[PDB]
Swiss-Prot record, chain C:
Belongs to the snRNP Sm proteins family. The chain holds residues 11 to 87 of 103 of the full protein. It is found in: Nucleus. Keywords: Acetylation, mRNA processing, mRNA splicing, Nucleus, Ribonucleoprotein, RNA-binding, Spliceosome. It comes from the Eukaryota. Its main location: nucleus. GO terms for molecular function: U6 snRNA binding. One of its GO terms (biological process) is mRNA splicing, via spliceosome. It comes from Homo sapiens. Residues 1-77 form the Sm domain. Plays a role in pre-mRNA splicing as component of the U4/U6-U5 tri-snRNP complex that is involved in spliceosome assembly, and as component of the precatalytic spliceosome (spliceosome B complex). The heptameric LSM2-8 complex binds specifically to the 3'-terminal U-tract of U6 snRNA. One of its GO terms (cellular component) is nucleoplasm. This is U6 snRNA-associated Sm-like protein LSm7. Component of the precatalytic spliceosome (spliceosome B complex). Component of the U4/U6-U5 tri-snRNP complex, a building block of the precatalytic spliceosome (spliceosome B complex). The U4/U6-U5 tri-snRNP complex is composed of the U4, U6 and U5 snRNAs and at least PRPF3, PRPF4, PRPF6, PRPF8, PRPF31, SNRNP200, TXNL4A, SNRNP40, SNRPB, SNRPD1, SNRPD2, SNRPD3, SNRPE, SNRPF, SNRPG, DDX23, CD2BP2, PPIH, SNU13, EFTUD2, SART1 and USP39, plus LSM2, LSM3, LSM4, LSM5, LSM6, LSM7 and LSM8.
Swiss-Prot record, chain D:
Component of the precatalytic spliceosome (spliceosome B complex). Component of the U4/U6-U5 tri-snRNP complex, a building block of the precatalytic spliceosome (spliceosome B complex). The U4/U6-U5 tri-snRNP complex is composed of the U4, U6 and U5 snRNAs and at least PRPF3, PRPF4, PRPF6, PRPF8, PRPF31, SNRNP200, TXNL4A, SNRNP40, SNRPB, SNRPD1, SNRPD2, SNRPD3, SNRPE, SNRPF, SNRPG, DDX23, CD2BP2, PPIH, SNU13, EFTUD2, SART1 and USP39, plus LSM2, LSM3, LSM4, LSM5, LSM6, LSM7 and LSM8. This is U6 snRNA-associated Sm-like protein LSm5. Belongs to the snRNP Sm proteins family. GO terms for molecular function: protein heterodimerization activity; RNA binding. Residues 1-76 form the Sm domain. Its main location: nucleus. It comes from Homo sapiens. One of its GO terms (cellular component) is U6 snRNP.
Swiss-Prot record, chain E:
Belongs to the snRNP Sm proteins family. Pfam families: LSM. The gene is LSM8. One of its GO terms (molecular function) is U6 snRNA binding. It comes from the Eukaryota. Keywords: Acetylation, mRNA processing, mRNA splicing, Nucleus, Ribonucleoprotein, RNA-binding, Spliceosome. Plays a role in pre-mRNA splicing as component of the U4/U6-U5 tri-snRNP complex that is involved in spliceosome assembly, and as component of the precatalytic spliceosome (spliceosome B complex). The heptameric LSM2-8 complex binds specifically to the 3'-terminal U-tract of U6 snRNA. It comes from Homo sapiens (Human). SUPFAM superfamilies: Sm-like ribonucleoproteins (SSF50182). The modification N-acetylthreonine is found at T1. Gene3D superfamilies: 2.30.30.100. Residues 1-75 form the Sm domain. This is U6 snRNA-associated Sm-like protein LSm8. It is found in: Nucleus. GO terms for cellular component: Lsm2-8 complex; nucleoplasm; nucleus; precatalytic spliceosome; U2-type precatalytic spliceosome; U4/U6 x U5 tri-snRNP complex; U6 snRNP.
Swiss-Prot record, chain F:
One of its GO terms (molecular function) is U6 snRNA binding. The modification Phosphothreonine is found at T79. It comes from Homo sapiens. Signal peptide: none annotated. Belongs to the snRNP Sm proteins family. Residues 2-76 form the Sm domain. This is U6 snRNA-associated Sm-like protein LSm2. Keywords: mRNA processing, mRNA splicing, Nucleus, Phosphoprotein, Ribonucleoprotein, RNA-binding, Spliceosome. Plays a role in pre-mRNA splicing as component of the U4/U6-U5 tri-snRNP complex that is involved in spliceosome assembly, and as component of the precatalytic spliceosome (spliceosome B complex). The heptameric LSM2-8 complex binds specifically to the 3'-terminal U-tract of U6 snRNA.
Length: 85, 72, 77, 76, 95, 95, 73
């Protein structure tokens, strides 16, 4: 029985896509994780997605910003899902 | 025991996995564990239409999983 | 531990629950983990418009079990 | 005893109400220590929107984390 | 080891998970960060009405709701520095 | 254990903690515990001091539950240790 | 030290703000090691001041407590 954790440790050293709580995603190289899904990612890019609304029409314009960092610890409680890019 | 036997006879079946946040993930159940962590292959993501189609395995936290269901 | 539910064993009680739910019903049984068996169960929900007007938001459920894990407060009714 | 009541509801219809305005009606197949429940041919209702969200077929594992109320025999 | 031992009976700034700062004195703690504090007051309203700033002396904060405790450089009892009110009010830990 | 032992190796390194409240704190790692609560010495609010709610605070205790991110430099970490330890650890938690 | 203060705080007036922003005003009769309480002679109030109900005993799950304001004593 390979557990999901055993199959996600097959993706160690590789670039992963992580979707987080608060309309944010990370992409980076997976150096480590535990059973809580705390993660150490190297060479990461965070993307923050927000909804701007036109005041008159109520039409939504999607906008984004990006942050990049060499090495980053991620608390597992913010993680919704992991996949590749 | 009824859940561990459920776990054994849903490996390999297509399933729907719904999270607490209301996101629905559909695909083939590659693995599960006792804490309800999930990996699914060929996963679609639904909320307000199609939001993601996934091309490799996706791993889902069991603490955030609301239900897992066979798809028929 | 602290509250012996045997004093409440047969009367209508008021129970608030973690998701915002309020339930009222006759206590018929319980365990140390505070799982409860209630009879004549009424479930009330809370919306922004339903505060003192708590009666329109009413569902009847009859015999129920309330899960002791999400129990937030218990008092007489 | 509450867990004895849930045992008595195996093979009966049951309605499972979560903390949110959401509920799940189906046949109770069994449960574990934590009250994770296996349900068969399940209807998923959101109460607030006044509509079912899906008709499930086969078995579901519904996590006991968000389960507030268990009603044997189902709705009315 | 990371204990709240050094912060005992010294002035402290507490951020609750709601997004609320507190000035207080830490009288006691446990291993779940349940905070027993005295002489508590806010920080966002001291510049408007300094009498209303003083909420209380003596309260139990539950450790589940504590985000942050900061150690401040108190000269002697009856003194602290700074005040603020035109800042983008701080958010909650929920997102 | 893994991340507890990982943060024990980074004591005395300069790190940036970004919280769930969007507050970002520069500081020197002094200690960590089993729940990954952090105590940071000689702190400064990074990004801007737009969160002036501290200022007079030089050392903070951070509840591990309110951490979103801990930014680190690449020089501080052996990536071979981290991958080897991770393969051994996920194997340990479930067996 | 905190739960020890609550054990000795048996018989004091107390104001309890919960997670749900509701206020309880009563006199502590018992606590446990998990911080659950029972209290005597009780006022239930919303954060906005709406008094909804009054009770003689009430049990509060410790997980739902935001904070407890004790007397200045």
């Amino acid at each position: 029985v390979e557990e999901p954790l055993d199959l996600i440790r097959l993706s160690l050293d590789e670039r992963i896509y992580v979707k987080m709580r608060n309309d944010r995603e990370l992409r980076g190289r997976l150096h480590a994780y535990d059973q809580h899904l705390n993660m150490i990612l190297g060479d990461v890019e965070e993307t923050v997605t927000t909804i701007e609304i036109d005041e008159e029409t109520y039409e939504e314009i999607y906008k984004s910003t990006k942050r990049n960092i060499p090495m980053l610890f991620v608390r597992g409680d913010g993680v919704v899902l992991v996949a590749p890019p | 025991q009824t859940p561990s036997d459920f776990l054994k006879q849903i490996i390999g079946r297509p399933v729907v996995v719904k999270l607490n946040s209301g996101v629905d993930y559909r695909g083939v159940l590659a693995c599960l564990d006792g804490y309800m962590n999930i990996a699914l292959e060929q996963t679609e993501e639904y909320v307000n239409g199609q939001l993601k189609n996934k091309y490799g395995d996706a791993f889902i936290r069991g603490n955030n999983v609301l239900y897992i269901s066979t798809q028929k | 531990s602290i509250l012996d539910l045997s004093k409440y064993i047969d009367k209508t009680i008021r129970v608030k629950f973690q998701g915002g739910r309020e339930a009222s019903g006759i206590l018929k049984g319980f365990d140390p983990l505070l799982n409860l068996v209630l009879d004549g169960t009424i479930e009330y929900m809370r919306d922004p418009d339903d505060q003192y007007k708590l009666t329109e938001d009413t569902r009847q459920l009859g015999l129920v079990v309330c899960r002791g894990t999400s129990v937030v407060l218990i008092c007489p009714q | 005893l509450p867990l004895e009541l849930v045992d008595k509801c195996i093979g009966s219809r049951i309605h499972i109400v979560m903390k949110s305005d959401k509920e799940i009606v189906g046949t109770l197949l069994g449960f574990d220590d934590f009250v994770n429940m296996v349900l068969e041919d399940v209807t998923e209702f959101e109460i607030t929107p006044e509509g079912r969200r899906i008709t499930k077929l086969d078995q579901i594992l519904l996590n006991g984390n968000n389960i507030t109320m268990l009603v044997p025999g189902g709705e009315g | 080891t990371s204990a709240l031992e050094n912060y005992i009976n010294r002035t402290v700034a507490v951020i609750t998970s709601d997004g609320r700062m507190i000035v207080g004195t830490l009288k006691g703690f446990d291993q779940t960060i349940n905070l027993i504090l005295d002489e508590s007051h806010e920080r966002v309203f001291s510049s408007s009405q300094g009498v209303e700033q003083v909420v209380l002396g003596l309260y139990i904060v539950r450790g589940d709701n504590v985000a942050v405790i900061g150690e401040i450089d108190e000269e002697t009892d009856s003194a602290l520095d700074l005040g603020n009110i035109r800042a983008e009010p701080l958010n909650s830990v929920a997102h | 254990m893994l991340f507890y032992s990982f943060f024990k190796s980074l004591v005395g390194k300069d790190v940036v903690v970004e919280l769930k409240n969007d507050l970002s704190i520069c500081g020197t790692l002094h200690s960590v515990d089993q729940y990954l609560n952090i105590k940071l010495t000689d702190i400064s609010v990074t990004d801007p001091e737009k969160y002036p709610h501290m200022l007079s605070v030089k050392n903070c205790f951070i509840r591990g539950s309110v951490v979103r991110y801990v930014q680190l430099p690449a020089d501080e970490v052996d990536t071979q240790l981290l991958q080897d330890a991770a393969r051994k650890e996920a194997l340990q938690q479930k067996q | 030290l905190p739960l020890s203060l609550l054990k000795t705080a048996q018989n004091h007036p107390m104001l309890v703000e919960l997670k749900n922003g509701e206020t309880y005003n009563g006199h502590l009769v018992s606590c446990d090691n998990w911080m659950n309480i029972n209290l005597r002679e009780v006022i239930c109030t919303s954060r906005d001041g709406d008094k909804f109900w009054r009770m003689p005993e009430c049990y509060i799950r410790g997980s739902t407590i935001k904070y407890l304001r004790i007397p200045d004593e």
